Amino acid sequence: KVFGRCELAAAMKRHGLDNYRGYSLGNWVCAAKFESNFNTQATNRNTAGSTDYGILQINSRWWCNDGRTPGSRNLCNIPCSALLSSDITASVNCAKKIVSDGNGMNAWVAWRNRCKGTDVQAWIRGCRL
Numbered sequence: 590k591v592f593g594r595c596e597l598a599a600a601m602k603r604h605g606l607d608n609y610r611g612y613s614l615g616n617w618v619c620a621a622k623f624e625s626n627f628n629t630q631a632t633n634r635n636t637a638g639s640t641d642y643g644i645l646q647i648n649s650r651w652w653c654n655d656g657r658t659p660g661s662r663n664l665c666n667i668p669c670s671a672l673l674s675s676d677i678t679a680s681v682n683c684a685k686k687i688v689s690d691g692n693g694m695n696a697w698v699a700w701r702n703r704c705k706g707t708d709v710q711a712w713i714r715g716c717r718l
Contacts (some may be wrong), residue, residue: 590675593626594618596606597644597677601659604681606613610688614718617684620700621645622712629680630673632636643672645697652683 591666592600598618601607607614624646625631633641639650639658649658653669665683687696694700 590629592621592629592644594622594627596712597621597627598716599718600677600680604677605685606681609685610693612688612694613709615712616694616700618712619704619707619709620694620697621632621668622701623699624697625672629675629677632673640669642669643674645680645684647672647680647683647687650666654688 597681598614599670600668601617602614606617624641625644627644629644631643631646633646635641637650637658637660639648640655641648642653642655647653647665647669649655649661649669651662652665653667653672654661654663655669665686667679667683672683688694690696694705
């Protein structure tokens with residue numbers, strides 16, 4: 590699915606992301622826009638043989654297993670193929686583990702460069718929540 594902005598805000602809030610570990614919903618929506626452009630099937634090559642998968646571009650070196658990334662750790666205990674679904678549950682549950690790892694949403698470089706700092710509440714402006 591390619592979500593709309595408010596549609597994904599509502600879905601993220603139903604899956605418990607609003608204020609998860611203290612990060613308001615607009616952070617998560619901003620991160621999804623600049624990681625995947627709201628597209629649940631997005632994939633991108635990354636370094637060290639890895640790939641980023643899905644709506645929050647979760648990476649295969651540490652978080653999911655894709656069977657093709659040397660050295661990989663699988664800390665979300667999930668195949669990366671399972672993050673390429675129009676249902677956001679697996680990606681939200683893995684995101685909850687990443688953001689709890691000690692460094693919060695800084696794990697997402699696009700969030701760190703294009704969202705953190707900014708008025709992220711604007712990303713849920715006008716949404717029915």
